[PDB]
Design a protein around this ligand. Structure first.
Ligand SMILES: [Cl-]
Lengths: 703, 18
């Protein structure tokens, strides 16, 4: 769980680099990279998954040392073609076999070189050692180790060289041409021991299909039956049999290397080497062995030799079977088989494959299936969408950016090839929508605000190109905004409603939060708001390109007054926002700000100023001395006043009255005491629109 | 049958080598 948490971290960042590369057009090698990470994490099943990755590399054409890599989903159209009897299908099947056969030849060839490099003086090669020369050296070293053959078997020799061993191990290493031309370099010597073989191997090396001419195939098969199949034991060089099995595909019913010293990799190689696909409607029973039969073989080996659950596993052998299923292009089954043993590896390997288009996804209509299901055509499907979303719920709460990287990968299957082109893109949207509503990181996901009101694009809309992205971001903002205004999260609501360009609503929200703060008595603790989540988490020991004050998010605003000033500040400086705010609304907030200031003066202890700013409001009749008539003029204005303003008139009085009575304390005095009681007339005339018993508290503070 | 019987021999032997 701890070493795992680290593994998930390094992988998550690679998936970050991955998406940056896809968007910018930078060369990227997903399989090569994912393999490197897996080889450095030291799992027991590691090496098998590393091998599988590299097998897919050879299959797909991911060659970093040549700056060559296939385009995004280059095989989707080919692999996802439902018509199993199409040109696309036949080509896809061929490439799997070719890739696996090629990979398994390279695998062996590397061993040959390693063994030679381990014994240089013994190898004794010339100035420009050719492959044939290296193979002979490899045979020599095997001989010295007594690991070339099983005892009691004598091999045909020529000048001290086991000619058949040399031919076989050249075919084993994929050097078919060099095998044929080695025989041709020794025509006479081969003519003496086998007059027909040269003809067969030359025909074998001259074609793309690695097949013999029909006429030759008949002759080779007959000969193999009459002179080799049922011959006295030890009457035939074990390697010669092997060469015939390979060259002539003799005895496909027994795909094994009995007389030879072989391991599991030699067996696997033989299976792919002998496999052939055909465009012909029919094949002879004795020549019928392609990928379908090969896959069927691997399938049965799984049930018989390997575990399905993690409780049945012990030493990490499940990796071998996953590896086999990959070679065979049983991709959906391979991933489904691995998930229980290592869901992390399963998830990322599925990403690697889906990127190239080698993983059949469920359609959107059946997006509620278990990991592995089958479609109408009985073909295996992986629920890529759900698998990802499910995977991100191990860290989306404490790392929403990483979660966005994965959810975006859902749109890999959202192209013309997948079939459900736009339905898969819709799934990705909902996955991201449920992420935004579930988290409070709006400054990160949707965007932040600069002092002048300009938006700082969020992570999601920057990944727009990678998810078919207009109104989606605008939509999820409005709902996330309404959800915040209704649930009393004032700061989030202001952030979101501004991003949605609903500036008028923003003013109403700050007016309300500011109105509530003004109402509280002078003495209570100041009203505090929960600040929006910061857009960046600058850290100890780390650098902060994002300095405080550069955005609303990094302003740490938790005071309704400071909030109102900030938003009203930018809205009034730029006429663009201003004209989009209703006059009564903007004017109301302005009045509230004055009120908050008037309140600050009282709580501070400045009487002279209080009176002035209150007089400046021109809401109360405070220039009248005893005038009965003018009072009415203002009483009729009350209903016109905005709610959030009117609701604090009761508070104003208590301030205006208290301050005036204090002013009496420090003609002028008589006049001040006059208005003081004049307010007490203001209330009365409109007493059934203020609190019930304000007088008694008012007159009290009035001595 | 021979190929199937042979595969069993190679993988059984391989498993025991773990
Ligand atoms: Cl074998």
């Amino acid at each position: 769980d701890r070493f795992l948490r680290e593994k998930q971290a390094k992988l998550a960042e690679k998936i970050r680099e991955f998406n940056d590369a896809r968007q910018r057009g930078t060369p990227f090698y997903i399989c090569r990279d994912l393999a490197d990470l897996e080889s450095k994490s030291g799992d027991r099943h590691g090496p098998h998954i590393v091998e599988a990755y590299r097998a897919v590399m050879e299959m797909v054409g991911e060659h970093p040392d040549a700056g060559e890599a296939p385009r995004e989903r280059q095989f989707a159209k080919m692999y996802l073609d439902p018509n199993t009897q199409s040109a696309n299908a036949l080509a896809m099947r061929k490439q799997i076999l070719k890739g696996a056969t090629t990979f398994l030849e390279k695998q062996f060839w590397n061993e040959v070189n390693s063994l030679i490099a381990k014994y240089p003086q013994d190898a004794n090669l010339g100035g420009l050692p050719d492959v044939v020369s290296k193979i002979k050296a490899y045979i020599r070293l095997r001989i010295a180790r007594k690991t070339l053959v099983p005892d009691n078997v004598e091999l045909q020799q020529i000048n001290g060289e086991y000619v058949w061993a040399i031919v076989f191990y050249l075919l084993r290493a994929g050097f078919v041409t060099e095998a044929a031309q080695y025989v041709n370099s020794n025509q006479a010597h081969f003519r003496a021991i086998d007059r027909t073989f040269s003809g067969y191997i030359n025909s074998y090396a001259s074609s793309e299909e690695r097949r013999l001419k029909r006429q030759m195939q008949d002759r080779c098969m007959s000969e193999y039956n009459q002179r080799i199949r049922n011959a006295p034991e030890g009457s035939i060089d074990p390697f010669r049999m092997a060469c015939y099995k390979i060259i002539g595909r003799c005895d496909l019913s027994n795909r094994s290397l009995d007389g030879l010293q072989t391991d599991v990799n030699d067996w696997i190689w033989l299976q792919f080497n002998l496999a052939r696909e055909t465009d012909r409607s029919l094949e002879l029973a004795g020549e019928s062995y392609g990928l379908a039969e090969l896959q069927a073989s691997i399938r049965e080996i799984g049930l018989k030799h390997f575990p399905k659950t993690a409780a049945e596993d012990t030493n990490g052998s499940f990796g071998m079977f996953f590896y086999l299923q990959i070679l065979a292009g049983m991709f959906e089954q391979a991933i489904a088989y691995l998930y229980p043993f290592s869901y992390v590896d399963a998830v990322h390997f599925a990403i690697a494959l889906t990127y190239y288009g080698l993983l059949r996804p469920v359609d959107a209509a059946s997006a509620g299936n278990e990991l592995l299901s089958h479609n109408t055509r009985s073909m295996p499907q992986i629920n890529f969408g759900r698998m990802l979303g499910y995977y991100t719920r191990d860290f989306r709460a404490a790392n929403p950016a990483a979660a966005v990287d994965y959810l975006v990968l859902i749109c890999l299957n959202a192209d013309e090839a997948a079939g459900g082109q736009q339905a898969q893109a819709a799934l990705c949207h909902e996955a991201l929508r449920e992420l935004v509503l579930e988290s409070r990181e709006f400054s990160r996901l949707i965007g932040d605000i600069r002092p002048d009101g300009r938006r700082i694009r969020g992570v999601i809309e920057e990944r727009g190109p990678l998810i078919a992205l207009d109104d989606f971001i605008r939509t999820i903002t409005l709902q996330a905004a309404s959800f915040a205004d209704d649930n009393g999260r004032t700061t989030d609501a202001v952030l979101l409603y501004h991003l949605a360009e609903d500036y008028d609503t923003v003013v109403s929200i700050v007016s309300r939060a500011l109105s509530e703060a003004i109402s509280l008595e002078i003495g209570e603790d100041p009203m505090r708001l929960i600040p929006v989540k910061p857009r960046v988490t600058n850290a100890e020991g780390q650098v902060e390109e994002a300095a405080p004050g550069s955005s609303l998010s990094l302003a740490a605003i938790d005071d309704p007054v400071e909030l109102a000033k900030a938003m009203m500040g930018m809205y009034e400086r730029d006429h663009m926002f201003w004209q989009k705010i209703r006059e009564p609304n903007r004017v109301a907030c302005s009045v509230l700000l004055q009120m908050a200031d008037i309140k600050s003066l009282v709580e501070q202890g400045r009487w002279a100023e209080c009176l002035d700013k209150i007089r400046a409001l021109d809401i109360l009749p405070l220039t009248a001395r005893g005038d009965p008539g003018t009072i009415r003029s203002y009483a009729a204005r009350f209903p016109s006043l905005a709610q959030p303003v009117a609701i604090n008139v009761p508070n104003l009085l208590m301030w205006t009255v208290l301050c005036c009575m204090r002013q009496r304390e420090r003609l002028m005095m008589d006049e001040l005491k006059q208005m003081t009681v004049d307010l007490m007339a203001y209330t009365s005339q409109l007493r059934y629109r203020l609190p019930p018993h304000l007088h008694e508290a008012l007159a009290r503070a009035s001595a | 049958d021979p190929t199937i019987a042979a595969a069993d021999k190679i993988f059984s032997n391989w498993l025991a080598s773990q």
